[PDB]
Amino acid sequence: VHLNKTIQEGDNPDLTAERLTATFDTHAMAAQIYGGEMRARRRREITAKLAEIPELHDSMPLPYMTREEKIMESARKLTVLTQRMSEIIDPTDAGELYHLNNEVLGIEGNPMALHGVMFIPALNAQASDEQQAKWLIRALRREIIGTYAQTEMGHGTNLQNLETTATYDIGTQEFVLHTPKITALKWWPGNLGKSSNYAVVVAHMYIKGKNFGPHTFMVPLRDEKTHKPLPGITIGDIGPKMAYNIVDNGFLGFNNYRIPRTNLLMRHTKVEADGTYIKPLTGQAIMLSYALNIATRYSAVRRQGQIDKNEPEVKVLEYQTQQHRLFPFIARAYAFQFAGAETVKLYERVLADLHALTSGLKSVVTHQTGEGIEQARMACGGHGYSMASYISEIYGVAIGGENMVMLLQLARYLVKSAALVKSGKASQLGPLVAYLGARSEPTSLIDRVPNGGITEYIKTFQHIAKRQTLKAANKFFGLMENGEKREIAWNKSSVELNRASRLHTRLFIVEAFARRVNEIGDITIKEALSDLLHLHVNYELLDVATYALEDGFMSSTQLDYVRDQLYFYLQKIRPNAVSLLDSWEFSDRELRSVLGRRDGHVYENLFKWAKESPLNKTDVLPSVDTYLKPMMEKA
Amino acid sequence: VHLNKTIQEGDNPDLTAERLTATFDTHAMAAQIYGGEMRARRRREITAKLAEIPELHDSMPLPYMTREEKIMESARKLTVLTQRMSEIIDPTDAGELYHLNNEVLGIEGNPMALHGVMFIPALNAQASDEQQAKWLIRALRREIIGTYAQTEMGHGTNLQNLETTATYDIGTQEFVLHTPKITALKWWPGNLGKSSNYAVVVAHMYIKGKNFGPHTFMVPLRDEKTHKPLPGITIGDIGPKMAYNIVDNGFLGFNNYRIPRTNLLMRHTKVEADGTYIKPYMLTGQAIMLSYALNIATRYSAVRRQGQIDKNEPEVKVLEYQTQQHRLFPFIARAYAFQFAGAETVKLYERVLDLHALTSGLKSVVTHQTGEGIEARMACGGHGYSMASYISEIYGVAIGGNMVMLLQLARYLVKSAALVKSGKASQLGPLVAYLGARSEPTSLIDRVPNGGITEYIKTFQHIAKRQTLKAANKFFGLMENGEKREIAWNKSSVELNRASRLHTRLFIVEAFARRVNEIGDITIKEALSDLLHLHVNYELLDVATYALEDGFMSSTQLDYVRDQLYFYLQKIRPNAVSLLDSWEFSDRELRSVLGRRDGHVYENLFKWAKESPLNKTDVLPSVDTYLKPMMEKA
C-alpha cells in the first residue's frame, strides 16, 4: 500500500497524484480525528458491512426526490435500521450510531431526528426515576415517537416570555395546557408536525394564579392506534424549508388540554396533589469536511486555465487563489474537531466558565463553518451550483437557535470578568479567562524571537482579545458613569461587546488546536497537523489584523511576515491537502456528491447523473406539449 | 396623505409607525432609484394593471410546487404573456419588460429565459441580414425557442480551449459538428435541455485541416413538429440545481451532425463554397435581489418584538437593537450604491461611443457583497429559514451570477502600476489616475473643519493605491529575482485580488458621492447623504487594516469612525423602512410572507403553513406504511 489508504487501482490519475504525496498514514490520522484507532476502524467496518446490505441504501439520488418521496424513503430505511441495527453496530455506542445514521439516513433529516437528540435527553434530565420507567423505556424501545417542544411562533429566545400556560387544577389534580394566542403556538420543534405522537412541552406553570416559570411536561399529542390528533390538539407541519426538509417541523396549540399532575417532569421539582410546590460542534466540523472533501477532490481533477503558457492546463488546485479559499478551512475543520474534544473534556472536569464559552463556540463555529462551506461551493465553479456537488444542501443543514443572544451571553461573562480585573481581583478569574488579568509585553514577538512553535501567536491573540474585552466593557461602564441606564448602555455597546466574545472564542479554538498538536507522539502526524496549525494561526491573525495594529502591538513588517507565512504554508499544505481530507474517511454512500466521488471520475458520472435525472424521463416535457409548442405553432 | 406612499389603512401599526417617520417622499426616491419620474411611475402602473389580470398570477405559492409543477406553471404564464403583453408594457422597453417578468415570472426562471438574453442578441451581433430575415424574425415572433451554447463540460471560460469541432465538408458544402469526448459536451446553457429547438453554438472551425478558432453556428436541435431530438443530437437536462430550477440548463453533443454552409453566422466572417476564409444590467439585478432581502428583513424587524431593553417597558422591536441595525442598514446603503454604480457604468458605456476592466471587478465585488448582505436571512431569526421568508431562493439565484473577473482587473492595475514606476504616470486613464497621485501624510478625517466625504474618498484612494502598488511590486520583485512571469503572478494573485477589490469598492463609494452631490430635492438629498455617511464609515472600518498599516490613519481617527457609524445607524433608523419601500416591490413580485407589505405576518404565516402540502392529510403515508407498524411491533 501507500501512506494514503484511500487510493484504489483505476482511480483518476489526477486525484491519485495528489494522494501519492501524502507524508502520513491516513488510517493513523483517522484515529486522531475520531479519538482512537478502534473508533476509526469501527467506522470502516460499519461502512463495509453496509455495502452488503442494499436495503439500507438510497433507492435513488436524494436530489432527484420530492419532499414527499424523501420522507417515505427515510421512514423505510429507519424501520430497517431498528430491525437490523445489531448486526452492524453496538447500539449503546453513540458514535457508532452517529456514523450509522450519517451513512444510512444522511443530513436532510429523518422522522426520529429529534427523538434521540432532545426527547430522550429531556427524559433523562427531567423525568423522575418512576417517570423514566414509564416513558423513557418506551422511547428507548421506539414504542413512541417524541420531540421537544419549546419555541413559539412569537418567541424563540427567552423562556421567560413564552405564552403557553400549564395551569394547575387542584380540584381535578390535572394540568390544563393552553395556547392563548396565535403567537403562543409551539412553532419549529423538529418532527413535531406529523411524526411524533408525544412531546416534552415547555410551558409557564401557574398554581393558584401565581406564575412559577417554565417547566416541562410529558404530553400525548396523537392517539397511539390511529395517530390522529387528540381532542384539543392543533398540530401540523409548518411548511417547506431552505434545507433539512425530511424533518417535519411543526406547530402545536392546546385548547384547555388536560394531563395528569404526574405528567409534570419531577426529578428536580415537585408539585403535590394539593398544589404545594417544592424546589429542593463535531457535527459542524464533519459538515465542513464534507464540503472540503468535495471541493478539494474536484480541484484536483478539474483542469482550467494556464499558469505557464507553454504547459497544459493546470489543475485548479494549482492556483494560490484556490488554495487560499480551501486550505484555511481544512485547518478550521480540524480546529473545530479538537475544540469539541476539549469542551467535552472540560465538562467532565466539572466536579459557568464553560456555559459562557460554549455559547460563543456554537455561534462562531456555525458562522465559520458556513463561511467555509460557501467558499468550498464557489471553489467548484459553475458545476458547484448543481445538486451533483451537494454542497448547497450541506450548507443549508449546517447553517440551520439565534446567534446574537449566544454571543451576548458570553459578553455578560466577559464584562463581569473585566469588572474583576479593574477592581484588583484578577486572582479571582477562572482559568479560561485568566488571560484577562495578565500583563502584556510592549509588542508582539512574532518574527522577533526564535520559538519554532506557536506561543507568540497565542500571546498575540490573548492580547487583542483582552484589549477588545476591556475596551468594550469600559464603553459600557463609561456610558453608565455618565448617567445612561444600564440596559441602554449595554445596547449602545453591544456590537463592540460581541466582537470581544468572538475574539475570546477564536482564541480558545487556537489554544485547543495547539494543545492537541503538542500531545501527539507520532512524528509524521504531528508534523502534518503542525503545518495545519501554522496555517491556521497566520490566516486567523491576518483576519483580525485591525485589532493587532490599532494600539501598535503589531507593525506593518510583522503583518508582512504573517502574509508570507500564510502563502508559504498554503504551498506546504498542498501535497497533504487531499490526504488530510481523506483521513475523515467518508464513503460515497455517506458523502452523496458526484463531484466529490472517491475515485475522481467526475465527468463520466456527472453525465450519468444528469441523464438519469427526472426531467429526462421523456424527450418532450408536458410544458412543451401543453404550452410552448402550441404557442409557437400559433405564431 | 403621508410622505411614505406605501402606507395603507389596516396595516400592522408596528410597521406603519416606522413608515410615518419618513423625512422624504417615497415616489421621488423611487424616481431616483429607477432613473426618472416616468420610469418609476410606469413600474407602479404595470403593477396595478397586473392586479386586474389573474391569469398572470401564481396559482399557488411557488415553494409549494415540485420542479415539474413550477415549469408547467411558468410555461402557462409564458403563453399568456405572449398574447397580452402589449396591453401592459411597451415590449421594446427593456425596463418595462424586466419589471413585468419579475412580477409575473419571478426570479426562479422560465422556459424562455435565454431566448431574449442571449439567443436574439447573438443573432443581432453575428447573423447576416439574409440570415436575420430567416431566423431573427422567427425568434422575435417566438415561432422558435433558442439559447446560446458556448461553455462545455470541461471548459467554461476560455473560448480558445473549447473542444467541439465544426468541420467544413467542401464536397457537400456542409459543416460537420462533432463532440469528440465527454468533456466537449455543451453543458450549462439555460433552456437548452428541454425547451429550445434551436441554438447558436460556439465551435472551433476546421477547413482543410487548419483550425481558424471559435466561430458561431445556427443549429437546429429538435424537429419543429415533434420536438424530438434530430438525428445525431444528444440533448437533455443536466439535473436539479441549488436554485433557479425553472430554467432547464442542458447538455448537448454532436455525432457528426451536418449543417449547411449558410448555418455559419456570417455578418463579419465568410466561408465560401470554396472553403475560402474571408476575415474582417446585472448590477441593477444584484441591487434588486439585495433590496428584496432587505425589504423582507427590515419589515420583519419592525413587527417582530423580542426581549426587553429597559426592563419596565414591553418587549422591543428587534429593529431597536444596535446589533440588528448593524447587520441591515449598511446593506441598505450598499444596494443604493450598487444601483448608482450601475447607472454610472452605463453613462460611461455611452461615453466612449478604462471600462472593461472596471466592469469585471464590479460584477465580482457586487455579487459577493450582495450574497453577504442577503445572508438579511439571519436577521429574520428562526423564521428566516422557512420558505415563507423566500430569502434562501433570493440568495441562491443572486449568487449564481469570480476569480477570473478579478484577475482581469488585476492585469489592468499592474499595467497601470508599471506606468507609475517607469515614469509614465501622466499616461494613466482617468479611472486610474489616482494611482499616480501623491498622498498627504495622513488621513484628514476628523482633522479638518468640514472636509466631509471628500476626506473619506481621499482615504479610500490612498489605501487602494497603496495596496495596488504593493501587490504589483511583489509581482515585479519576484521576476527581478528570476521567477518566470506566470509563476510570479500566481505567487502574487491573492494580494493582487485584494488590490482589485479595493479599487472597485473605491469606485462604488465615488459614484455614490457623485449621485448625492447632483441631487436638488433637499429631502431626498439629505436622506441619501445620511446613507452615504453610513456607507463610507462602515466601508472604511471594514478595510481599516490597510488604513492603519502605514500609520495613515491613527487609532484616534478610527474611534472617530466608529462613533460616526453608530451615530448614522440611529440616524438612518427613522427612514430605514421608507428607503426600502422606495424600491416599490409589490407582494406579488416580492413573494415573501415575512416581508408582506402590510406587516400582518403571524396570521398569514399560520395560513401559509396550514395550506402547505404535508398538511393535506393528518396521517402521512410514512406513518401508515412504516411509522405505525414499527411502533406497534416494539
Side-chain angles (χ1 to χ4, degrees), chain B residues 229-257:
Chain B
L230 296 173
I233 298 291
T234 301
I235 191 161
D237 182 74
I238 66 169
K241 304 165 293 171
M242 87 182 261
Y244 204 56
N245 280 299
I246 304 180
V247 165
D248 49 297
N249 303 78
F251 61 88
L252 174 61
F254 304 99
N255 183 14
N256 288 306
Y257 190 78

Side-chain angles (χ1 to χ4, degrees), chain A residues 5 23-24 72 151 168 209 215 244 256 310 313 329 417 460 593 614 626:
Chain A
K5 298 301 189 287
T23 68
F24 63 93
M72 274 300 280
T151 66
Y168 185 52
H215 289 71
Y244 204 54
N256 290 305
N310 298 316
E313 289 183 285
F329 300 102
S417 304
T460 300
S593 169
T626 307

